[PDB]
Design an enzyme around this catalytic site. Structure first.
Site, mmCIF file in Angstrom:
data_model
loop_
_atom_site.group_PDB
_atom_site.id
_atom_site.type_symbol
_atom_site.label_atom_id
_atom_site.label_comp_id
_atom_site.label_asym_id
_atom_site.label_seq_id
_atom_site.Cartn_x
_atom_site.Cartn_y
_atom_site.Cartn_z
ATOM 1 N N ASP A 37 -5.387 0.313 3.739
ATOM 2 C CA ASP A 37 -4.910 1.477 4.458
ATOM 3 C C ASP A 37 -3.414 1.428 4.746
ATOM 4 O O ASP A 37 -2.996 0.763 5.699
ATOM 5 C CB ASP A 37 -5.726 1.664 5.746
ATOM 6 C CG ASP A 37 -5.314 2.892 6.530
ATOM 7 O OD1 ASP A 37 -4.597 3.764 5.985
ATOM 8 O OD2 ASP A 37 -5.724 3.008 7.708
ATOM 9 N N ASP A 224 -0.105 7.437 1.985
ATOM 10 C CA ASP A 224 -1.278 6.947 2.711
ATOM 11 C C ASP A 224 -2.510 6.713 1.849
ATOM 12 O O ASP A 224 -3.161 7.661 1.422
ATOM 13 C CB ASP A 224 -1.602 7.903 3.862
ATOM 14 C CG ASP A 224 -2.727 7.420 4.726
ATOM 15 O OD1 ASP A 224 -3.224 6.288 4.550
ATOM 16 O OD2 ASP A 224 -3.115 8.172 5.630
HETATM 17 C C1 LIG Z 1 -7.162 4.522 10.454
HETATM 18 C C2 LIG Z 1 -7.429 5.734 9.550
HETATM 19 C C3 LIG Z 1 -8.828 5.687 8.875
HETATM 20 C C4 LIG Z 1 -8.979 6.095 7.539
HETATM 21 C C5 LIG Z 1 -10.207 6.083 6.882
HETATM 22 N N1 LIG Z 1 -10.162 6.505 5.474
HETATM 23 C C6 LIG Z 1 -11.283 6.639 4.535
HETATM 24 O O1 LIG Z 1 -12.413 6.436 4.797
HETATM 25 C C7 LIG Z 1 -10.882 7.045 3.098
HETATM 26 C C8 LIG Z 1 -11.803 7.567 2.190
HETATM 27 N N2 LIG Z 1 -11.381 7.873 0.962
HETATM 28 C C9 LIG Z 1 -10.111 7.692 0.588
HETATM 29 O O2 LIG Z 1 -9.629 8.007 -0.703
HETATM 30 C C10 LIG Z 1 -10.632 8.328 -1.655
HETATM 31 F F1 LIG Z 1 -11.425 7.241 -1.925
HETATM 32 C C11 LIG Z 1 -9.210 7.175 1.494
HETATM 33 N N3 LIG Z 1 -9.623 6.841 2.718
HETATM 34 C C12 LIG Z 1 -11.331 5.615 7.537
HETATM 35 C C13 LIG Z 1 -11.207 5.199 8.872
HETATM 36 C C14 LIG Z 1 -9.980 5.228 9.532
HETATM 37 F F2 LIG Z 1 -9.952 4.811 10.817
HETATM 38 N N4 LIG Z 1 -6.358 5.616 8.547
HETATM 39 C C15 LIG Z 1 -5.762 6.538 7.952
HETATM 40 N N5 LIG Z 1 -4.710 6.218 7.023
HETATM 41 S S1 LIG Z 1 -6.125 8.274 8.198
HETATM 42 C C16 LIG Z 1 -7.274 8.306 9.588
HETATM 43 C C17 LIG Z 1 -7.177 6.984 10.442
HETATM 44 C C18 LIG Z 1 -5.746 7.183 11.116
HETATM 45 C C19 LIG Z 1 -5.383 8.423 11.946
HETATM 46 S S2 LIG Z 1 -6.698 8.590 13.118
HETATM 47 O O3 LIG Z 1 -6.631 7.434 14.023
HETATM 48 O O4 LIG Z 1 -6.458 9.893 13.750
HETATM 49 C C20 LIG Z 1 -8.304 8.559 12.354
HETATM 50 C C21 LIG Z 1 -8.381 7.346 11.417
#
Ligand SMILES: C[C@]1(c2cc(NC(=O)c3cnc(OCF)cn3)ccc2F)N=C(N)SCC12CCS(=O)(=O)CC2
Length: 381
Positions: A37, A224
């Site tokens: 991430d 990202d």
């Molecule tokens: C930590 C978090 C995060 C991301 C994901 N991603 C996926 O699950 C996924 C799925 N598919 C992707 O690409 C295709 F495969 C790519 N990421 C999960 C949990 C998280 F806590 N990381 C990100 N870069 S944005 C959402 C966020 C951060 C902002 S915030 O706190 O408002 C909510 C959570």
């Protein structure tokens, strides 16, 4: 430097469930799958038997665990994660041969954090201290790794994607030249918090969108790996869609599809890719008045949805509006090999050797181009 065979193909995942890498934590090493991430800065792993989880970090079993006696609470719009901060010995089995003492947030309660059906149990926040929770005192994993080893201050990502299993490579401390074609082009990291960058010009199918510099980066543009979509600011999203609709006039689709509110489907093996435009983002170059351009295909922004049980080749439109600025998620990154050159405060882009394409069009990284007032595309409070 240059060839890192031991790390090639160390990323796995399912379509829409992100990319993860195997890690070990504690002594003896407890194996976990951890989501890569670049949009966050905490090393946070499940530490309790949540029913969705294949496994979780069990501190009681680790002789090298050290408690920091601090909680952490991370809320967001759809829910939350909270945990107890500690440190432990960490290694990446298909990474460099080192063990690092890193911070670990041990997750003990969450709402809509983990994905039901996914194969990862934690998140490797690879962005900078400034956005680490609770505050910038909590050293991110990568800062610990560089500070504690001889590993160069750089990593790169080849996120491969389907066209449902995905794959790719995370090269820790280097670049593998076999993962890209053509040359790398570098965009400067504007500030070391997220991987912040400046979008300088937008083209749909070669047509400039003609909006002010500033809108494309309102209030931010980031790279990202933890976001699926290309997320564009509200106004930028509107203009882009108007243009994409116009370019795809040969076949019509409901208005809901463009808002990712419903799917659209074609007969198997008969997608009209050709009816959809290329999308070009121009990024601030390394040199004054110099820019470069990255170009993605419909194969990147029309995501295959296998999950639909109401139909027996459906797709989601994966360009979506944002209130948090531009997010160059998987939609972008699946087109390119992306080099996070932390040492030199820059991000490189090159055509990914694994990007999904057809016989007609290819993802592209092209430059140099002349663009004036690139600093003015940037946003200030
Ligand atoms: C930590 C978090 C995060 C991301 C994901 N991603 C996926 O699950 C996924 C799925 N598919 C992707 O690409 C295709 F495969 C790519 N990421 C999960 C949990 C998280 F806590 N990381 C990100 N870069 S944005 C959402 C966020 C951060 C902002 S915030 O706190 O408002 C909510 C959570």
């Amino acid at each position: 430097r240059g060839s890192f065979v031991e790390m090639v193909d160390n990323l796995r995942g399912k379509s829409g469930q992100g990319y993860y890498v195997e890690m070990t934590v504690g002594s003896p090493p407890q194996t976990l799958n951890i989501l890569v991430d670049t949009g966050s800065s905490n090393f946070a792993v499940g530490a309790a038997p949540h029913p969705f989880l294949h496994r979780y970090y069990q501190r009681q079993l680790s002789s090298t665990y050290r408690d920091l006696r601090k909680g952490v609470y991370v809320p967001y719009t759809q829910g939350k994660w909270e945990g107890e901060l500690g440190t432990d010995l960490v290694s990446i089995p298909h990474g460099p041969n080192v063990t690092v003492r890193a911070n670990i947030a041990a997750i003990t309660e969450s709402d809509k954090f983990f994905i039901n059906g996914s194969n990862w149990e934690g998140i490797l926040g690879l962005a900078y201290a400034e956005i680490a929770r609770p505050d910038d005192s909590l050293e991110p994993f990568f800062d610990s790794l560089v500070k504690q080893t001889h590993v160069p201050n750089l990593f790169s990502l080849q996120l491969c994607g389907a066209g449902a299993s995905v794959g790719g490579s995370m090269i820790i401390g280097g670049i593998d030249h076999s993962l890209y074609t053509g040359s790398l082009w570098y965009t400067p990291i504007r500030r070391e918090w997220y991987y912040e960058v400046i979008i300088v010009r937008v083209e749909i199918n070669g047509q400039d969108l003609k909006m002010d510099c500033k809108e494309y980066n309102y209030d931010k543009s980031i790279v990202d790996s933890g976001t699926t979509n290309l997320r564009l600011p509200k106004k930028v999203f509107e203009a882009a869609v108007k243009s994409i609709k116009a370019a795809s006039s040969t076949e019509k689709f409901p208005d809901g599809f463009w808002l990712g509110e419903q799917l659209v489907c074609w007969q198997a093996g008969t997608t009209p890719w050709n009816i959809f435009p290329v999308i070009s983002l121009y990024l601030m170059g390394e040199v004054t008045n110099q820019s470069f351009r990255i170009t993605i295909l419909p194969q990147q922004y029309l995501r295959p949805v296998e999950d639909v049980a109401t139909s027996q080749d459906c797709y989601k439109f994966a360009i979506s509006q944002s209130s948090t600025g531009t997010v160059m998620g998987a939609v972008i990154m699946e087109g390119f090999y992306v080099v996070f050159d932390r040492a030199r405060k820059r991000i490189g882009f090159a055509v990914s050797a694994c990007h999904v394409h057809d016989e007609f069009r290819t993802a592209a990284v092209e430059g140099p181009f002349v663009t004036l007032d690139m600093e003015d595309c940037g946003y200030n409070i």
